[PDB]
RNA sequence: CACCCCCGUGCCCAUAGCACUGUGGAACCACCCCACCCCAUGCCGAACUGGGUCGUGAAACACAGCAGCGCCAAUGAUACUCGGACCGCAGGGUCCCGGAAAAGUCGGUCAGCGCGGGGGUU
RNA sequence: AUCAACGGAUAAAAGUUACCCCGGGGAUAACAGGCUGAUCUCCCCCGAGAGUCCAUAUCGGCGGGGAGGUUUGGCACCUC
RNA sequence: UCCCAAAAUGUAACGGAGGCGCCCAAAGGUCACCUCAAGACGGUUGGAAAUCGUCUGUAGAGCGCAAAGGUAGAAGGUGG
RNA sequence: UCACAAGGCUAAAACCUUAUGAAACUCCGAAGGGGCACGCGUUUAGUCCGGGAGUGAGGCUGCGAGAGCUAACUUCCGUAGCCGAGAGGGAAACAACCCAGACCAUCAGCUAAGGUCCCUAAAUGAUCGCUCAGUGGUUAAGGAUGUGUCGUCGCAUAGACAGCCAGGAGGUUGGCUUAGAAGCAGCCACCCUUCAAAGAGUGCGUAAUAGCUCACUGGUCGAGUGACGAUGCGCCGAAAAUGAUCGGGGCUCAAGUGAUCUACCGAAGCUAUGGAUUCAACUCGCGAAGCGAGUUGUCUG
């Protein structure tokens, strides 16, 4: 990913397939202007669970995880990105995609898989340490069995940014 | 004579005339006795040569200027840094 | 539909969708790309079109609610007041506004129950996916 | 409770009086009566008991009065404005006052 | 910095008609040598659009 | 304002607050102690109030740690909008120019500044 | 002092006119026109289901989009 | 009184809501003192609430009435 | 505070995660608006006393609201402008919209809004494009291998998508359901063998069978072929009463339409030349105001 320009009038860059950018930690804090087409290829990938380094028109490289983005309500396009300088050491609490493995024991009677987090705040991590998913088996699952937090097999290190006894995964009715 | 009601309910006429608000503002010349606040409880509250009124009106005791005190919001304050 | 309490007639002011996100409860969603007020038979319309075609299960998230009340002419006049309470419930749509999301179904099975749903609303719609993680 | 003394405290209208205020500790026994300036955040006068109780704890009530009434003329002040922290003026604080009352 | 009147003030709003007066014209065309001053620059930058404003 | 600490009292009244945790007793302050009176409880020295120690520092307080919660809070961007100019039959929308949020994120904080009196550097 | 018609005409006051009269009003209604199109008339989208079977040979729940100006109106613009 | 009312004041409709035509000899003056609603847990007639006790508690209560502003350093509650 | 969506949970109320709506909700909160001081700087009104009035039916448009059906050339407030009381150009015609405020004279000149085929003033201009419907010169839901341009998945000379010859299973008439239900009136599943390959199965069919073909496989060709979406211009949807038409003629061999660039036309606007008026200051007549003349500025719907 290849930045390019700073200014603080974006008139320059809207007419263009160009997204307006930002990049924090404590220490730096500077504008920035990338490519939409760049961005968005590579986004659908990655998310808040992954990272890929910018250098800026001028041999700069810096490494950076997305930290919120904000779209157009009429358009579906994205419109600004906000990038939080990696550390190395310790990080934040990153939200990380629940996903479903294997057919349900409830799910064959009438019932269904609902994922009701589809995405969870885990702190104390670790940087480049940061889980891109996180796989929860269900086939042990019945009709009217909920899954809470305090009963996922987090990645080493990681911890629990959420209460232990709320509903991540549960199995539904007919109807 | 009927047996149904007095006065016929589901009406809209009925409003009143009223007034209110600041008289005089900060950086302004007072006399003795100029009305500088018209409110209903105490929006502002009295401060330096600034006395209230019955009704919570807020007026000038001693001539001068008109100062505002913006403490965040309930401890707001009007008062007269007297000129001479 | 209607709602259970209140205080009985409103107004009317329109501008870009306020609390409407992408991807909440649900895996594909209904969006509006055009303003409106959607009666609550037109809801109803749309959730019966949706739950006969996903016939058992019940996985419809209709984000929308009829909370405005509208009102009406008895016949003629005008030289009377303010009228009709009870003519029909409304819900104010700003385009961006997810009006309804479906799960545990294919993404053919949704592209059709929306394209149903769609030709009983007043509105222009598009049907979407994931990738919305704002805040939670 | 708190609110007694914040009562009087409120209740001594600083500059619209032009008077001084005359502060005293009487919770304990090492009473404070102190003279303080309303405008600036200064103490004028004062009279401890620490220093001397003259074998007396709460009799020493004069004998602070006395010693305060005296530190005021030294220093000028004739004007006061006497405030009870949430002491129901009576006993050991009722003393204090006519000790100062009597001494200027 | 040279002002010149090249629109009507009719059927422009009272204040910018005031302002073209203030500024010191009274005929479409009439220009004149003006003041280098916040007010003086305020009055040029309220009726700017009725104005062919030089350097 | 030599310096440490304490008791009073300010300006400032959450970047000062809470929680959790630790230090301080016989200088100061707190409980404590007894009360027949002064004085007091729509009942009860609980509180006011009087006489006083000891005993303790439990409780309270003061002080110190800490970023779990509160509180404070950017940059960017957007919403909205004064003025200029348009689109749509309409609900409604756009462009140029300044102005500019709210929420959120980065992060910042267990304050700062006076006056007087008391006790310490054996 | 419900002088409450609340700046209060007298201390003191209801009806009726198709037997009616005068001064005016298109400042204002009935007819008609006009603007509008809720209502009215018609047409179109979708396809639940009806049709032995098969949505569409016929029919079209709930809902949606228009056209017309022949209805009942709205409004009160020329014409009293 | 609130809303309409376009962050000054003002602003219409047979627009949307709702009160007043009195009351209090203390519900006034002043000086003292007091501090609320609710919830959890524990208990006599009881037991959904009540009278008691501790723990949380800007106020979620009260203010003779309608609503709005205001207010616990009291405008709330009690006495001389 | 009131309303409200999904789940947790508990004996519902509370509380927790997620998610909202508000004229009479607000932890917050603009742009703007108003008071005052200053004029640091341009302008030319203001106030106070007194004489004479007229007017107290407004109208339209934009914006902000209510009423109304988010109708009306509707009604009622706020706000800005014009008409009223406004001529002149433009909008075919046309109080109001766009431009612009007419002191008088000229067979002078420049512009504005608008315009530049002919009616009819002035480019049948210049460049790159688009649209062949007379769209331009009646609206929509919905519909479409219409053409122009950017993009996102995929199968591909290890030989695809289409045509062509051959084949398309056996369990098994999957079970259930039923008067039957056998790939095809409706639930559950979509597991297995043989293999170059064949899904307990797509559309048609008879009353269930059969039938007739597709999903998948090979041979011969030989090259790009297909599915979502975006967006420009166009197509269908598109029926009204006396005779038809975009003002007409007529235009694509653009006189349509997006972007750019000059040039010209165009008013009672600005200008040239002359001339009159209003007020004002600057000269002089006259014993004094006061009024003459006289320039210069200024004014005159
Ligand atoms: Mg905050
Ligand atoms: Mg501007
Ligand atoms: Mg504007
Ligand atoms: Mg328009
Ligand atoms: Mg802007
Ligand atoms: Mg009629
Ligand atoms: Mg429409």
């Not at chain 1, 600004?80 to 939200?95: A, L, W």
């Not at chain 1, 305090?150 to 911890?159: A, M, N, S, V």
């Not at chain 3, 959607?38 to 299960?57: D, L, W």
């Given at each position: 990913?290849?930045?390019?320009?700073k200014?603080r009038?974006?008139?320059?860059?809207?007419?263009?397939?160009?997204?307006?950018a930002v990049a924090y930690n404590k220490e730096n804090n500077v504008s920035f202007?990338?490519?939409?087409?760049?961005?968005?290829?590579?986004?659908?990938?990655?998310?808040?669970?992954?990272?890929?380094?910018?250098?800026?028109?001028?041999?700069?490289?810096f490494?950076a995880?997305?930290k919120?983005?904000?779209?157009?309500?009429?358009?579906?396009?994205?419109?600004?990105?906000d990038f939080y300088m990696?550390?190395?050491?310790?990080?934040?609490?990153?939200?990380?995609?629940?996903?479903?493995?294997?057919?349900?024991?409830?799910?064959?009677?009438?019932?269904?898989?609902?994922?009701?987090?589809?995405?969870?705040?885990?702190?104390?991590?670790?940087?480049?340490?940061?889980?891109?998913?996180?796989?929860?088996?269900?086939?042990?699952?019945?009709?009217?069995?909920?899954?809470?937090?305090?009963?996922?097999?987090?990645?080493?290190?990681?911890?629990?940014?959420?209460?232990?006894?709320?509903?991540?995964?549960?199995?539904?009715?007919?109807? | 004579?009927?047996?149904?009601?007095?006065?016929?309910?589901?009406?809209?006429?009925?409003?009143?005339?009223?007034?209110?608000?600041?008289?005089?503002?900060?950086?302004?010349?007072?006399?003795?006795?100029?009305?500088?606040?018209?409110?209903?409880?105490?929006?502002?509250?009295?401060?330096?040569?600034?006395?209230?009124?019955?009704?919570?009106?807020?007026?000038?005791?001693?001539?001068?200027?008109?100062?505002?005190?913006?403490?965040?919001?309930?401890?707001?304050?009007?008062?007269?840094?007297?000129?001479? | 539909?209607?709602?259970?309490?209140?205080?009985?007639?409103?107004?009317?002011?329109?501008?870009?969708?306020?609390?409407?996100?992408?991807?909440?409860?649900?895996?594909?969603?209904?969006?509006?790309?055009?303003?409106?007020?959607?009666?609550?038979?037109?809801?109803?319309?749309?959730?019966?079109?949706?739950?006969?075609?996903?016939?058992?299960?019940?996985?419809?998230?209709?984000?929308?609610?009829?909370?405005?009340?509208?009102?009406?002419?008895?016949?003629?006049?005008?030289?009377?007041?303010?009228?009709?309470?009870?003519?029909?419930?409304?819900?104010?749509?700003?385009?961006?506004?997810?009006?309804?999301?479906?799960?545990?179904?294919?993404?053919?099975?949704?592209?059709?129950?929306?394209?149903?749903?769609?030709?009983?609303?007043?509105?222009?719609?598009?049907?979407?996916?994931?990738?919305?993680?704002?805040?939670? | 409770?708190?609110?007694?003394?914040?009562?009087?405290?409120?209740?001594?209208?600083?500059?619209?009086?032009?008077?001084?205020?005359?502060?005293?500790?009487?919770?304990?026994?090492?009473?404070?009566?102190?003279?303080?300036?309303?405008?600036?955040?200064?103490?004028?006068?004062?009279?401890?008991?620490?220093?001397?109780?003259?074998?007396?704890?709460?009799?020493?009530?004069?004998?602070?009065?006395?010693?305060?009434?005296?530190?005021?003329?030294?220093?000028?002040?004739?004007?006061?404005?006497?405030?009870?922290?949430?002491?129901?003026?009576?006993?050991?604080?009722?003393?204090?006052?006519?000790?100062?009352?009597?001494?200027? | 910095?040279?002002?010149?009147?090249?629109?009507?003030?009719?059927?422009?709003?009272?204040?910018?008609?005031?302002?073209?007066?203030?500024?010191?014209?009274?005929?479409?065309?009439?220009?004149?040598?003006?003041?280098?001053?916040?007010?003086?620059?305020?009055?040029?930058?309220?009726?700017?659009?009725?104005?062919?404003?030089?350097?």
């Amino acid at each position: 990913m290849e930045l390019t320009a700073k200014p603080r009038t974006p008139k320059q860059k809207l007419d263009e397939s160009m997204i307006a950018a930002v990049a924090y930690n404590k220490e730096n804090n500077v504008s920035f202007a990338l490519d939409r087409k760049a961005f968005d290829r590579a986004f659908r990938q990655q998310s808040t669970t992954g990272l890929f380094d910018i250098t800026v028109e001028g041999g700069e490289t810096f490494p950076a995880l997305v930290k919120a983005v904000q779209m157009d309500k009429r358009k579906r396009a994205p419109i600004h990105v906000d990038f939080y300088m990696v550390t190395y050491g310790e990080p934040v609490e990153v939200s990380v995609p629940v996903h479903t493995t294997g057919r349900s024991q409830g799910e064959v009677q009438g019932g269904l898989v609902d994922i009701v987090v589809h995405n969870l705040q885990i702190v104390a991590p670790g940087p480049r340490r940061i889980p891109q998913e996180l796989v929860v088996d269900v086939t042990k699952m019945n009709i009217g069995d909920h899954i809470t937090a305090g009963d996922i097999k987090l990645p080493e290190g990681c911890t629990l940014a959420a209460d232990p006894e709320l509903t991540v995964v549960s199995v539904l009715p007919p109807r | 004579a009927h047996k149904k009601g007095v006065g016929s309910s589901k009406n809209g006429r009925d409003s009143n005339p009223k007034y209110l608000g600041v008289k005089k503002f900060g950086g302004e010349v007072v006399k003795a006795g100029n009305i500088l606040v018209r409110q209903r409880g105490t929006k502002f509250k009295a401060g330096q040569g600034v006395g209230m009124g019955r009704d919570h009106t807020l007026f000038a005791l001693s001539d001068g200027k008109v100062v505002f005190i913006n403490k965040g919001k309930g401890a707001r304050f009007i008062s007269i840094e007297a000129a001479q | 539909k209607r709602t259970k309490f209140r205080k009985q007639f409103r107004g009317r002011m329109t501008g870009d969708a306020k609390g409407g996100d992408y991807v909440a409860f649900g895996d594909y969603g209904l969006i509006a790309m055009e303003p409106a007020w959607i009666k609550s038979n037109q809801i109803e319309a749309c959730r019966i079109v949706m739950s006969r075609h996903f016939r058992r299960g019940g996985k419809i998230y209709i984000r929308i609610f009829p909370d405005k009340p509208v009102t009406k002419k008895p016949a003629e006049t005008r030289m009377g007041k303010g009228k009709g309470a009870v003519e029909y419930w409304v819900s104010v749509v700003k385009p961006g506004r997810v009006m309804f999301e479906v799960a545990g179904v294919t993404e053919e099975q949704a592209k059709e129950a929306f394209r149903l749903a769609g030709h009983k609303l007043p509105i222009q719609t598009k049907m979407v996916k994931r990738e919305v993680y704002d805040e939670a | 409770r708190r609110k007694l003394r914040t009562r009087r405290k409120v209740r001594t209208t600083t500059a619209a009086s032009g008077r001084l205020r005359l502060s005293v500790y009487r919770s304990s026994k090492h009473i404070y009566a102190q003279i303080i300036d309303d405008s600036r955040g200064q103490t004028l006068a004062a009279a401890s008991s620490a220093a001397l109780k003259s074998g007396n704890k709460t009799d020493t009530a004069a004998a602070v009065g006395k010693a305060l009434a005296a530190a005021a003329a030294e220093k000028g002040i004739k004007q006061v404005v006497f405030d009870r922290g949430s002491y129901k003026y009576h006993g050991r604080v009722k003393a204090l006052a006519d000790a100062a009352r009597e001494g200027g | 910095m040279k002002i010149k009147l090249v629109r009507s003030v009719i059927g422009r709003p009272g204040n910018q008609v005031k302002t073209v007066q203030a500024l010191g014209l009274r005929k479409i065309g009439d220009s004149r040598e003006v003041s280098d001053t916040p007010a003086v620059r305020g009055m040029v930058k309220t009726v700017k659009h009725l104005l062919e404003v030089q350097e």
